[PDB]
Write a structure and sequence with these properties.
The structure is cut from a larger assembly and holds two copies of chain A (31 residues), one copy of chain B (80 residues), one copy of chain C (73 residues), two copies of chain D (37 residues), one copy of chain E (141 residues) and two copies of chain F (154 residues). In chain B, 6% of the residues lie in helices and 20% in strands. By secondary structure, chain B is mainly β. Chain B has one domain: 2-Layer Sandwich (Alpha-Beta Plaits), CATH 3.30.70. Chain C has 73 residues and is of the alpha+beta class. Chain C is 37% helix and 10% strand. Chain D is 65% helix and 0% strand. The radius of gyration of chain D is 15 Å and the shape is rod-shaped. Chains in contact: A-I, B-E, C-D, C-G, C-H, D-F, D-G, D-H, E-F, F-G, F-I. Chains B and E meet through strand 1, strand 2 and strand 3 of B and helix 1 of E. The structure holds chlorophyll A (8 copies), beta-carotene (2 copies), iron/sulfur cluster (2 copies) and calcium ion (CA) (2 copies).
Chain lengths: 31, 80, 73, 37, 141, 154, 154, 31, 37
């Protein structure tokens, strides 16, 4: 009934793109 | 570089000069044909050996020959 | 020396095998013609040649190998 | 894999020599030779 | 002759252009005088906007420069027949290559010299037995 | 304008394109700060940096996929294979610097010089065998590393 | 003529003879391509090359003839003896370069210069202890090396 | 009845001098 | 100390990463940034 390892890895992959998008926002907020 | 030798069978039809896309051939004056001109190749270090001058020539066994000799950066046609 | 005893059934051996990529099947299958090391069955005619010439022991044709080394030098 | 013949220790060092040590120094010497001026 | 006067044409940039041979061994440069702001296809790849007036374009091989000269002399109704192809070294020297005599090589003028002209037919060439070890060529000697 | 891909370094006749993969700000601040490219280093240190990340990962494909993963000498065979690969690697690049930089000996950009590339070869060899031996030592004592990351030696 | 031994480098007053051992083609292409003599190297790389072949063979006389060949700690005592010898060796040659190249600091032939000989000392130490540890590691795991040269781990 | 190790080592030593002589022949054939 | 949950292998590498590898490269990048000109 608990979670699986593939759900945790999918959560890491689906949170990888907020890291890229926050990197884009931080870069354009610096300049 | 290659060696472009032009023999005395040339009739001065200047087809080989306008066919070569590298400006090695050029018409010099002469007195052995009706057109009174013969092709000549001074800039043989720029000839790649493409033999496009030996496709537009009207004589039997065409009067211009391109003997493929040594190679270099120009004769191998390299942009690198 | 084991080929001249019965040259109708036993197989001649060219040389041995020493590649380190052999597993266990390739060692248990290449130990042919009665030899504990992996060998390679000779298919050239050097054994029938050396028997027809008159060579019997390995020592005389080893001495022929040393003689051909000197002749090549 | 062993050797029933005499000097079984000798292909144990001659097979890696002619396999690696001979062609590496041959290609090293040849690449130094054919690319020098 | 020694100085290249011109502006670069309007071009976005390509990949088949000047490689590392340009700043090391040699490159080439074509200069021509346009009439209008038309469009020409460079032999590097793609199209470019030919600027008005005298403009300069850097290429990597002489064959690309002569192919551009053919495109300038045939594929335009204001036929551009006043282009100059120079060879630029990384040392800074500029060699006038084409049409260096001043007139095009397709027509004859006085001032040229017959270089590389034989006085025989090809059937009158010598045989490679008599010059078998002279080191020369059967067509040269 | 709003176009993100342009000509490389202004002039549009060099065969390259200023592109968000090629010439973005992040690329020219990350590739330009890699050890083979960042300014102010001798080639011995930058070769030592390049060598360590290459030695540290070459232990992997032989300790997990090599022929000695059957037996108990797994990491020893992995280290031996990676030491052979880095020895061949430094032989190749030291012979490259031996044959390429003979002659004119250009002054600036000291990595592309014969003494510079030989310093790079010495650095690559030290970092290569050191990264290989550290990855071997951290893979062989994996029970110790698991014990000091889980905290069961207390 | 047919004489094979001549004067050294033309002039016959230098105390040397051009000889098929001294000044043959093979000698001046083999000694001249040894690491201490071939051109285009920094002294750190050529010291690292000289150090490796010296560390690799110094394990031998103590693992086969040293006093620890009786017990099971044979190769450990051989490595310890060779590490002591290479440490004394690099102490001797670094002190040599410390005391010889003080003063005028001649420009050309960079090996015979104080910074050059100190680079040679650092290279000799790294290659020395590395060649010693590799020969120790390849002698201690000799069952593994015999298994991967005979091919019995498959 | 088979060979001995000293015969193999003597074969290597007696074939060492063809290696030197072929090296001499290759050197004088190059020049 | 172990993990009864799914993917117990993952904090074993994420705790030293965010503890050491993230702040060392963050302080390294920041000290390179705030002291440059
Ligand atoms: C990954 C696969 C692989 C590899 C690497 C090898 C490798 C080898 N096998 Mg092998 N083998 C394999 C698969 C493989 N095998 C398989 C699947 C089988 C079937 C079961 C066999 C069956 C087999 C037998 C039966 C024997 C070998 C032997 C050998 C060894 C050759 C001895 C040697 O070095 O001579 C040197 C190699 C050569 C001369 C060949 C190279 C020829 C070159 C390319 C041409 C010349 C180039 C140029 C002109 C000169 C070189 C230039 C250079 C100097 C710069 C070698 C270690 C033999 C052995 O143990 O040695 C006695 C042997 O008897 N193998
Ligand atoms: C040309 C003939 C010839 C050929 C094809 C081979 C082939 C072989 N020998 Mg071998 N051998 C030869 C002559 C030859 N041998 C001679 C004359 C001797 C006496 C010194 C030996 C002594 C010898 C030993 C002691 C061993 C081998 C082994 C081997 C095998 C592995 C390769 C190796 O390590 O060799 C390396 C060989 C040597 C270091 C010495 C021989 C070198 C010869 C003299 C040079 C041959 C010149 C050749 C024609 C040059 C070709 C030029 C061409 C590329 C243009 C391989 C089957 C090994 C084996 O059985 O493994 C299972 C092994 O342990 N050989
Ligand atoms: C012809 C000769 C030859 C020989 C003898 C070998 C031998 C070997 N190969 Mg191989 N191979 C060859 C040709 C050859 N190959 C060719 C031509 C190819 C291309 C098709 C391959 C492709 C290939 C692959 C893809 C693989 C092998 C592997 C192996 C090894 C199997 C066991 C192992 O993991 O070793 C362990 C590794 C070693 C023994 C490496 C040598 C390191 C030594 C011990 C260090 C000695 C250096 C020392 C400090 C210097 C001494 C100085 C000297 C003067 C004394 C074995 C040593 C397998 C492997 O894992 O090898 C890494 C493997 O996966 N080979
Ligand atoms: C090209 C296809 C291919 C592949 C994938 C393999 C794969 C393998 N072979 Mg193999 N082999 C091949 C062709 C291939 N072989 C051929 C053609 C032959 C000759 C016939 C052999 C002969 C052979 C032998 C004899 C043996 C193997 C063995 C092996 C295994 C271990 C070898 C090893 O450690 O590699 C080492 C490889 C490396 C060190 C290179 C790693 C490259 C990395 C991963 C690239 C990374 C790129 C990166 C992800 C990109 C991003 C970087 C950055 C930007 C982040 C492995 C599964 C051995 C075994 O035991 O089999 C199980 C073995 O004994 N092979
Ligand atoms: C007999 C003299 C002698 C000795 C003991 C050594 C010993 C060594 N050399 Mg070396 N070398 C020599 C002469 C010698 N060299 C000469 C004359 C040249 C000029 C061609 C070179 C050029 C050279 C280069 C370019 C490199 C080495 C390297 C090395 C070291 C490890 C790799 C190696 O060679 O495998 C041990 C093999 C032997 C001892 C057999 C010697 C046979 C020939 C003469 C060696 C030729 C080297 C060859 C080009 C590459 C070998 C590597 C190979 C194993 C993959 C080792 C300490 C490498 C290194 O680690 O440096 C940082 C390296 O990159 N050497
Ligand atoms: C000069 C004669 C001599 C010789 C041959 C030996 C030999 C030996 N002694 Mg010894 N000893 C001697 C004098 C000698 N001793 C004296 C005068 C004393 C004082 C009274 C001692 C006191 C002593 C003690 C207290 C002990 C020994 C021990 C030993 C053994 C191991 C030592 C060792 O590892 O050496 C290390 C040597 C080296 C690292 C140098 C190696 C030199 C190499 C081989 C030269 C190579 C040159 C090369 C081949 C040329 C070509 C190179 C290139 C061109 C190819 C060894 C058999 C030990 C033992 O256990 O005895 C069995 C021990 O405990 N000795
Ligand atoms: C902001 C909310 C938040 C907080 C406070 C934490 C806190 C924690 N998480 Mg975590 N996590 C989060 C969101 C959060 N997480 C999200 C959204 C995910 C899905 C990808 C995860 C996935 C995750 C895993 C898979 C694991 C943890 C673990 C942990 C613990 C150890 C720290 C660590 O390794 O994290 C490292 C976390 C990551 C590498 C991914 C999450 C990164 C998030 C998305 C960034 C949060 C942005 C944040 C607000 C920025 C602050 C800016 C501020 C300083 C100005 C720690 C209690 C570990 C644990 O349980 O150990 C016992 C563990 O294994 N987390
Ligand atoms: C927030 C994160 C964090 C984490 C995860 C740890 C974790 C640890 N601390 Mg620690 N510590 C922290 C914060 C942290 N600390 C802070 C903020 C302080 C200041 C108050 C301290 C002060 C402190 C002290 C005073 C001590 C520890 C100790 C320890 C270790 C106990 C077991 C041990 O001896 O490890 C053994 C050591 C290690 C595991 C070191 C890491 C070496 C790794 C394995 C090598 C990997 C490098 C590799 C080559 C590179 C890989 C590249 C990468 C990209 C993959 C443990 C690893 C004790 C200790 O002995 O640590 C040395 C100890 O005495 N810590
Ligand atoms: C993040 C990221 C990335 C990256 C990734 C990767 C790929 C990484 C890698 C990593 C790695 C790959 C790492 C490694 C490391 C290593 C090291 C850390 C090493 C060290 C070494 C040592 C420690 C050694 C030492 C020594 C000894 C022991 C002895 C001998 C000598 C010497 C001294 C050398 C990318 C790019 C994608 C992008 C962005 C993001
Ligand atoms: C052939 C010949 C010869 C020679 C011989 C001999 C004498 C040889 C030697 C040999 C040897 C003597 C070899 C050796 C080798 C070595 C090596 C190969 C080493 C390596 C090392 C390493 C691998 C290491 C690494 C490392 C580590 C591990 C860690 C620390 C650091 C370092 C990085 C360093 C003569 C002259 C007679 C003449 C002619 C012929
Ligand atoms: S094409 Fe032939 S005939 Fe015409 S000008 Fe050239 S060489 Fe003479
Ligand atoms: S080979 Fe080509 S470049 Fe040379 S003369 Fe003939 S057509 Fe001109
Ligand atoms: Ca296995
Ligand atoms: Ca003892």
């Amino acid at each position: 009934m608990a979670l699986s390892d593939t759900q945790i890895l999918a959560a890491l992959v689906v949170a990888l793109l907020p890291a890229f998008l926050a990197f884009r926002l931080s870069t354009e907020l610096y300049k | 570089s290659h060696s472009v030798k032009i023999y005395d069978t040339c009739i001065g039809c200047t087809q080989c000069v306008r066919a070569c896309p590298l400006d090695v051939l050029e018409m010099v004056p002469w007195d052995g044909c009706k057109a009174a001109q013969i092709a000549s190749s001074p800039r043989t270090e720029d000839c790649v050996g493409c033999k496009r001058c030996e496709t537009a020539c009207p004589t039997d066994f065409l009067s211009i020959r391109v003997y493929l000799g040594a190679e270099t950066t120009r004769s191998m046609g390299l942009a690198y | 020396e084991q080929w001249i005893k019965d040259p109708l059934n036993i197989r001649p051996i060219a040389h041995a095998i020493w590649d380190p990529h052999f597993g266990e099947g390739a060692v248990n299958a290449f130990t042919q013609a009665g030899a504990s090391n992996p060998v390679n069955i000779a298919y050239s005619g050097v054994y029938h040649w050396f028997y027809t010439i008159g060579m019997t022991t390995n020592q005389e044709l080893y001495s022929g190998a040393v003689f051909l080394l000197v002749l090549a030098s | 894999m062993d050797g029933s013949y005499a000097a079984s220790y000798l292909p144990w060092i001659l097979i890696p020599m002619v396999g690696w040590l001979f062609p590496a120094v041959t290609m090293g010497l040849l690449f130094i030779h054919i690319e020098s001026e | 002759m020694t100085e290249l006067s011109g502006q670069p044409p309007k071009f976005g940039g390509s990949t088949g252009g000047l490689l590392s041979k340009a700043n090391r061994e040699e490159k080439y440069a074509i200069t021509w005088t346009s009439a209008s702001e038309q469009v020409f296809e460079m032999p590097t790849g793609g199209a470019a906007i030919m600027n008005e007036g005298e403009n300069l374009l850097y290429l990597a091989r002489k064959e690309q420069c002569l192919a551009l000269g053919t495109q300038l002399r045939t594929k335009f109704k204001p036929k551009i027949q006043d282009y100059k192809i120079y060879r630029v070294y990384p040392s800074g020297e500029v060699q006038y290559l084409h049409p260096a005599d001043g007139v095009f090589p397709e027509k004859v003028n006085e001032g040229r010299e017959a270089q590389g002209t034989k006085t025989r037919r090809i059937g009158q060439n010598p045989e490679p037995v008599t010059i078998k070890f002279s080191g020369k060529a059967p067509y040269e000697v | 304008s709003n176009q993100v891909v342009q000509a490389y370094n202004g002039d549009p006749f060099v065969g390259h394109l200023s592109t968000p993969i090629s010439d973005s700000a992040f690329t020219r601040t990350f590739i330009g700060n890699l050890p083979a490219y960042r300014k102010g280093l001798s080639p011995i240190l930058r070769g030592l940096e390049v060598g360590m990340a290459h030695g540290y990962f070459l232990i992997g494909p032989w300790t997990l996929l090599g022929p000695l993963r059957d037996s108990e000498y797994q990491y020893i065979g992995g280290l031996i294979g990676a030491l052979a690969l880095i020895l061949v690697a430094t032989a190749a690049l030291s012979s490259y610097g031996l044959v390429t930089f003979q002659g004119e000996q250009g002054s600036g950009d000291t990595l592309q010089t014969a003494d510079g590339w030989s310093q790079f070869a010495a650095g690559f060899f030290v970092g290569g065998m050191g990264g290989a031996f550290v990855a071997y030592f951290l893979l062989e004592n994996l029970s110790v590393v698991d014990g000091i990351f889980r905290g069961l030696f207390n």
